Amino acid sequence: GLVPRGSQILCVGLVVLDVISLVDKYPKEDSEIRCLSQRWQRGGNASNSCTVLSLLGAPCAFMGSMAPGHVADFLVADFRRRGVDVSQVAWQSKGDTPSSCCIINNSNGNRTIVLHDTSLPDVSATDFEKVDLTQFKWIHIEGRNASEQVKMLQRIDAHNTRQPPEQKIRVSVEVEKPREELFQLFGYGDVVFVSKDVAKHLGFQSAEEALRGLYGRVRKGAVLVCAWAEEGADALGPDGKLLHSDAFPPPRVVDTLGAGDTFNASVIFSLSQGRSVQEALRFGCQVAGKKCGLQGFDGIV
Amino acid sequence: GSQILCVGLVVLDVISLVDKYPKEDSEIRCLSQRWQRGGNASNSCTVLSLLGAPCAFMGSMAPGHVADFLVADFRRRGVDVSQVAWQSKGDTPSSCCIINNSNGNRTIVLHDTSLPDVSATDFEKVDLTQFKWIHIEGRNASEQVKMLQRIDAHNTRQPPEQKIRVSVEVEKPREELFQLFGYGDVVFVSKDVAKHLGFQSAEEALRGLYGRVRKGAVLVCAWAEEGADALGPDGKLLHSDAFPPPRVVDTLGAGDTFNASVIFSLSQGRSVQEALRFGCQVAGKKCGLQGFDGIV
Numbered sequence: 323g324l325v326p327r328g329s330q331i332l333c334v335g336l337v338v339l340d341v342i343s344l345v346d347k348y349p350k351e352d353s354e355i356r357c358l359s360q361r362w363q364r365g366g367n368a369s370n371s372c373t374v375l376s377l378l379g380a381p382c383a384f385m386g387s388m389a390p391g392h393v394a395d396f397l398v399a400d401f402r403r404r405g406v407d408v409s410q411v412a413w414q415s416k417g418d419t420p421s422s423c424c425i426i427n428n429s430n431g432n433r434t435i436v437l438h439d440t441s442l443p444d445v446s447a448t449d450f451e452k453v454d455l456t457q458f459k460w461i462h463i464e465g466r467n468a469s470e471q472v473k474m475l476q477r478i479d480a481h482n483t484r485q486p487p488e489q490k491i492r493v494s495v496e497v498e499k500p501r502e503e504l505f506q507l508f509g510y511g512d513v514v515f516v517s518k519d520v521a522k523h524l525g526f527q528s529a530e531e532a533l534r535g536l537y538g539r540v541r542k543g544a545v546l547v548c549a550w551a552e553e554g555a556d557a558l559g560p561d562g563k564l565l566h567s568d569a570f571p572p573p574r575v576v577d578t579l580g581a582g583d584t585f586n587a588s589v590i591f592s593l594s595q596g597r598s599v600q601e602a603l604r605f606g607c608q609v610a611g612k613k614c615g616l617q618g619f620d621g622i623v
Numbered sequence: 624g625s626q627i628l629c630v631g632l633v634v635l636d637v638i639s640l641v642d643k644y645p646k647e648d649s650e651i652r653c654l655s656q657r658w659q660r661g662g663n664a665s666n667s668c669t670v671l672s673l674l675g676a677p678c679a680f681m682g683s684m685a686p687g688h689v690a691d692f693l694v695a696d697f698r699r700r701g702v703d704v705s706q707v708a709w710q711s712k713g714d715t716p717s718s719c720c721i722i723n724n725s726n727g728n729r730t731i732v733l734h735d736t737s738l739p740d741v742s743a744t745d746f747e748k749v750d751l752t753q754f755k756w757i758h759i760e761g762r763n764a765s766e767q768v769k770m771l772q773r774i775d776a777h778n779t780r781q782p783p784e785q786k787i788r789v790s791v792e793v794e795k796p797r798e799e800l801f802q803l804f805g806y807g808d809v810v811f812v813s814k815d816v817a818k819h820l821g822f823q824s825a826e827e828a829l830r831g832l833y834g835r836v837r838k839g840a841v842l843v844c845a846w847a848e849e850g851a852d853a854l855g856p857d858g859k860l861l862h863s864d865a866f867p868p869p870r871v872v873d874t875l876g877a878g879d880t881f882n883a884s885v886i887f888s889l890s891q892g893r894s895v896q897e898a899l900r901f902g903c904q905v906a907g908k909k910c911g912l913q914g915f916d917g918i919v
């Protein structure tokens with residue numbers, strides 16, 4: 323159906339079916355064990371951020387690769403249950419829709435993960451070339467196939483060149499995985515999110531160190547953002563002024579899975595509403611904190 | 624008297640194929656993923672269909688997208704699903720299956736959704752005349768005993784040529800199930816159950832447990848790659864060596880392949896010796912393939 327021009331927030335990235343099993347003891351190889359509880363959850367960074375944007379009251383869309391089948395069916399029904407627009411999915415003829423299997427041991431909190439395979443082709447620059455960008459006010463790209471995503475980012479830049487400042491599509495990039503190919507993505511977007519994990523891998527021992535160490539890698543005018551879990555989040559822009567927000571931890575932590583994606587979606591949302599970077603940092607920390615005391619995404623607002 | 628009925632579980636298996644079994648607290652990327660219809664009675668129906676046998680499945684399912692996959696899979700195989708016990712409370716069972724590509728080893732993390740099992744009242748509503756053979760996978764034993772008493776009652780009124788043959792499977796090491804040994808013409812006892820009762824071989828298990836079976840019954844015990852043994856009223860122990868593939872790639876459902884193949888061979892009039900050999904043959908062939916396609 324009709325989507326008003328410059329009304330949606332697009333998130334480009336991964337969707338995965340997460341099968342979480344909670345066990346009394348880790349299974350011995352070649353055995354059958356009854357788990358205590360099992361959950362099927364739609365995951366992925368871009369995927370999780372869409373859930374949060376819908377719950378925040380933002381019209382949003384997901385762009386990512388899926389293969390026709392029963393896994394895709396579950397994921398599409400889950401996206402739709404969360405009011406996520408799924409018209410821009412890159413339907414693939416080869417490969418499996420990603421599925422991960424998580425075994426959580428009760429006696430110690432240990433997590434064993436059998437990650438999805440590599441068979442599914444990622445969204446390409448040619449796939450993205452075919453997208454009418456006019457319905458999007460904001461485009462968020464989760465760093466994966468960087469050389470392709472760079473061409474996608476060059477296409478949004480080309481678009482904005484022909485646009486009055488109010489019809490300009492805002493852009494954000496996420497560098498969450500400590501893979502060198504992704505570090506070229508720092509030079510793209512108005513907002514650049516860098517994970518604690520990536521920063522630590524580059525030798526940075528704090529969000530301040532990471533922002534001061536990596537700011538020279540961003541495009542002119544860009545805002546570099548780094549959330550450091552329960553130590554709050556920092557942002558740094560062209561004025562050279564480091565901004566900080568403390569974390570808003572819940573009275574009891576229940577579920578941290580997707581807290582970072584809650585932060586990213588909330589920062590994007592607050593900025594898209596015309597709020598300052600300081601206000602967006604505080605808001606992202608508040609929503610992220612609220613999420614940590616909740617199972618899943620229900621009740622974050 | 625044309626169909627083989629299998630009473631038991633249907634489970635959606637979420638299968639991950641790995642290069643090496645994951646060490647606890649680690650992250651490993653799998654090689655490939657698939658969805659497979661599983662459960663012991665359910666797997667035996669797949670094998671019976673592929674063997675050319677008209678078969679039916681009786682088991683509990685709850686309406687939903689999991690049941691939809693399973694029903695479409697059953698139907699794709701030509702398994703008769705008319706006798707499924709549709710439940711209004713619960714979800715359909717699912718499991719996480721890790722298959723090690725190096726050796727075919729399978730590890731299952733199972734989610735028993737606490738769906739109500741098939742009851743004796745559910746089974747009383749079944750027209751037994753279309754069945755030549757009824758196989759029950761041991762689950763809710765006190766309720767399955769009444770189901771077995773119903774088949775016995777039916778056979779009493781039948782001439783020997785129109786008598787329904789009965790098999791029972793005691794796969795789980797739960798004491799409740801050990802009453803099922805006294806029922807059926809063919810009794811399959813797992814290696815796992817035998818080991819739990821202190822038996823170190825199929826011959827030990829058969830000699831140790833034979834006194835527990837019905838008069839004239841055949842006790843069968845498959846001991847994985849060590850082959851299978853059977854023991855009947857003549858007191859003569861029968862053995863078949865396994866048929867291992869040169870490369871074992873997937874053991875998930877090998878035992879169910881054995882059970883279905885023994886049942887099939889016996890239903891065709893073959894000797895117990897021939898049925899044991901055929902059972903090991905087909906199970907062995909399955910172990911060198913992914914899934915059940917190509918076992919025949």
Ligand SMILES: C[C@H]1[C@H](O)CN1c1nc(N2C[C@@H]3[C@@H](CC(=O)O)[C@@H]3C2)cc(C(F)(F)F)c1C#N
Pocket residue numbers: 549550551552553554555568569570571572575578579580581582583585606607608610611612614
């Ligand atoms: C996004 C960051 C901002 O820096 C604040 N916020 C928080 N992140 C936390 N984690 C991130 C990481 C999550 C795993 C995952 O993202 O899947 C672990 C724990 C924990 C808390 C907490 F618990 F203190 F509330 C907060 C708060 N506020």
Ligand SMILES: C[C@H]1[C@H](O)CN1c1nc(N2C[C@@H]3[C@@H](CC(=O)O)[C@@H]3C2)cc(C(F)(F)F)c1C#N
Pocket residue numbers: 729845846847848849850851865866867868871874875876877878879881902903904906907908910
């Ligand atoms: C049924 C028994 C007869 O005794 C022969 N047969 C085999 N069972 C095997 N397993 C049983 C158990 C399976 C897991 C599961 O049933 O889900 C493990 C391994 C392995 C092989 C093998 F590999 F050697 F071929 C054969 C053969 N033939």
